[PDB]
């Protein structure tokens, strides 16, 4: 008789090994309750029905489907009947318990802090439009601007194209809003810290100072950087750790609800504003 | 079916080297084997964690560190691992697969000097970290083969802890007199040091690489191609390390040698 076990299916840890804080959080939470936990990673060359059968081989008591990058889970509808809970992803067809970041609250607290600090004309650089978080973050940004008496439709907005090759388009977008060395914005709201990286390199290389000449705000607090920005980047923490914890407890305490719970995305003010 | 038990000692503090455990899991399935991973956190303790992976009763065991270290665990706990990935055993001799830090730094510095640079500022990682001294042998050999005595160059060692990455800007500006730098290039211990270097040089009004070439190390999956211009670096072979470690168990090897895995030079546009 082995202890209770949580089976986890990671759909894309291969292309984005940053959200590993989700699977680590699950493993740590399960151990703090006398449970075990294994993780099956889905690569590109293998295929779903095989991978799902493999995690069923360990015969788990509960199952968690997770995406390292907030997505909508592109798997057969017949394979979305096994997962007791979804971590950082939502099911379009069947309704399943889901724990996702509160993208609208995160972007709102960030933009609210920026405007409150005195900025009024931010350049807004959004992530790909179809990504599920992009539209929720923009609602937060818009709500913060309207509460400050600013119509967000009057600001400069830009959407990135899908793929890391597009991070190199950011510099051209920033320089396009700079006329004869003086910028047509007093701040820059970045879809993520990788966009902030591009922004820092472009502004410093243009002879501008952060934040004396231009404030900057990122999103994610990427475990790989965040504190490496000069100056330290004001950003928003993606709650990968709380997402994994809440997902594990849902199974540990055998919950039956199938609601989509939005986890708090805390604002990390630093020195970029 | 046969199963490989993996013990990750520090994926909590450095979740970048996850490419090792992923590579192990992928290689084991390509041979009809299974594989589980036990992560050691800070709040738990070894004897408990080691007993836990023995619970799954594995056919082979791999001890791995996300950051090349010398494995700070009881000598009696280093008798179970069939192979060590990205780490070495000081006491008992155990089969180990580690990066060829000397070859990696050599190919990098060789390419830099060959491109025409002669006075690089060398920013090394903490001295006690086992790779730091091996990378410096590579750097020195490249410089001596180019007729340069590395003892005449400016060297600096970082202090242990991420808090010290913020000391890099001061070290770079200390080698700049009245706006003109006293170096024509910068050899960085890793891409995180390169990040600090880029921010400091661009903020100083210097151009990369027209005024100062820059070279990193690791090719951090999280950046590398995000540098402006794209950072010339060295790839840490986490993927090959995991693969070779899995095969050692799959094919039941008996040697207890320390194999150095190739660390390939990724030239880009920072030089």
Numbering used by the authors:
A (entry chain A): 59 to 331
B (entry chain B): 61 to 331
From the reporting publication:
Here, we report the deposition of 14 structures of enzymes from both the core and accessory genomes of sequence type 23 (ST23) K1 hypervirulent K. pneumoniae. Targets were selected using a shotgun approach aimed at uncharacterized metabolic proteins from ST23 K1 hypervirulent K. pneumoniae. In silico multilocus sequence typing of all K. pneumoniae isolates was completed using Kleborate. This analysis showed that 64 of the selected proteins are part of the K. pneumoniae core genome, defined as genes present in at least 95% of all strains; the other 132 proteins are part of the K. pneumoniae accessory genome and are overrepresented in the highly virulent hvKp clonal group CG23, which contains ST23 (7). Thus, the x-ray crystal structures presented here provide the basis for functional analysis of 12 uncharacterized proteins associated with high-risk K. pneumoniae infection.
In all, structures represent both metabolic proteins and possible transcriptional regulators.
